[PDB]
């Protein structure tokens, strides 16, 4: 009935003075913009229909046209920043925030969806949606004794829109808004729907990606144990944002990193550091590098959980970026660790892969590996076993690497290599 309409017919129907003809034309526009294959968003915009849809959003007497217009504008705001800006310029933000209070659940759901698309464009439209006062009705939609009584799709769309209101930086979301949203985020983080859990973990990862003050706002709510529990989840869509948030949290203070450790996160890294997905391995190794850059008792906790063998393994075989993160972890371990801990590191078989990685075409990992080498040699000097070490490095073909690096382009590279071969070989 309203399928395969032309934009000219849609315009002719919406420009009529017949609410039913306008409704049919708006539904035709919705069906047109709901097509997976090249929806004619720009044609609809050029036609000048966004203002008419935004006006229809306010016709409470005709809820069907409200729903159809919300759907159409949602799909126009789902595209480019210019198309989302066209939606916003029509005055759709306050209209959607008003629709949030609709007695019809499908209309309020579509308004949540549209506002999520608008806030996901970037920090500017996000903060504008917040200034128009969307957070209060959004959270009110979730003010129920048990979230399980809400419809699955409804709760998922609300969780995702809230995640987008926590998303993007430069600037990060307003502090008062984050404080307003966090308790509902904790509630959702304790929900049982994997989609809700994944979106809530993404929201927490967004909120934790920044200065230690934001990380502290998050950690004070006590979500770290639940983040670790979800880190042990089987659904990768959940593990990814959980690991991202844990890593973000360990980028901060030693006390926040210790909060992460106390929740039992390390017990999960034996799997994360051998995870078949390369992104998970890289994120876990980067988190491990930021943990090895912490206090000595935290390095000792890393040792106790048997994670040094896993770092050795990742260094021996893994995607090169994960190997670079592992080299950073090793250098931090050797820079902040004790002599006993560095001796343990050597006894775990770090030297051979550390040497083998010195033949890479990335100067930075070369510098990192050479710095770790120097630290291990210093710890050996404190024991008088420098010679034994030197012999190990020679036996695995490392001295050849350092000598060939003496003739390298970068300055600090050949400087450190020459220092090594002069002071120990």
């Amino acid at each position: 009935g309203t399928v395969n309409w032309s934009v000219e017919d849609i315009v002719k129907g919406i420009n009529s003075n017949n609410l039913e003809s306008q409704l049919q034309a708006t539904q035709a526009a919705r069906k047109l913009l709901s097509r997976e294959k090249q929806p004619p968003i720009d044609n609809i915009i050029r036609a000048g229909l966004i203002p008419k849809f935004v006006s229809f959003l306010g016709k409470t007497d005709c809820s069907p046209i409200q729903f159809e217009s919300a759907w159409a504008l949602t799909n126009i705001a789902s595209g480019t920043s210019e198309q989302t800006k066209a939606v916003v310029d029509g005055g759709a933000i306050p209209a959607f925030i008003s629709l949030l209070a609709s007695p019809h659940a499908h209309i309020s759901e579509q308004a949540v969806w549209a506002l999520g698309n608008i806030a996901g464009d970037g920090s500017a439209f996000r903060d504008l949606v917040i200034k128009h006062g969307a957070i209060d009705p959004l959270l009110a939609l979730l003010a129920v004794p048990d979230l399980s009584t809400l419809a699955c799709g409804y709760l998922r769309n609300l969780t995702w829109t809230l995640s987008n209101l926590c998303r993007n930086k430069n600037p990060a979301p307003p502090l008062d808004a984050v404080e307003q949203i966090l308790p509902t985020l904790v509630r959702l983080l304790h929900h049982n729907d994997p989609e809700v859990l994944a979106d809530s973990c993404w929201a927490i990862s967004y909120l934790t990606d920044g200065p230690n003050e934001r990380i502290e706002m998050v950690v004070k709510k006590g979500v770290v144990p639940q983040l670790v529990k979800l880190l042990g989840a089987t659904e990768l869509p959940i593990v990814t944002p959980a690991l991202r948030a844990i890593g973000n949290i360990v980028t901060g203070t030693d006390e926040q990193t210790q909060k992460v450790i106390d929740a039992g996160a390390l017990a999960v890294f034996p799997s994360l550091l051998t995870n078949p997905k390369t992104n998970i391995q890289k994120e876990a190794t980067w988190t491990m590098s930021n943990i090895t850059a912490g206090r000595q008792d935290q390095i000792q906790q890393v040792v106790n959980h048997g994670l040094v063998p896993f770092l050795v393994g990742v260094l021996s075989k893994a995607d090169f970026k994960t190997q670079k993160e592992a080299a950073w972890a090793i250098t931090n371990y050797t820079s902040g660790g004790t002599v006993e801990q560095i001796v343990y590191l050597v006894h775990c078989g770090i030297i051979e892969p550390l040497m083998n990685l010195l033949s890479a075409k990335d100067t930075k990992i070369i510098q990192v590996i050479l710095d770790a080498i120097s630290n291990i040699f210093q710890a050996a000097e404190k024991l008088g076993e420098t010679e034994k070490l030197s012999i190990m490095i020679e036996e695995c073909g490392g001295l050849d690497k350092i000598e060939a690096l003496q003739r390298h382009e970068n300055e600090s590279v050949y400087k450190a290599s020459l220092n090594l071969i002069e002071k120990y070989f």
Binding site: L33, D121, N164, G247, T251, S335
Partner: peptide, 13 residues
């Protein structure tokens, strides 16, 4: 030892 650093829109179909 230093700590280092490292769907926005959805259509309804």
């Amino acid at each position: 030892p230093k700590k280092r650093p490292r769907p926005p829109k959805r259509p309804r179909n």
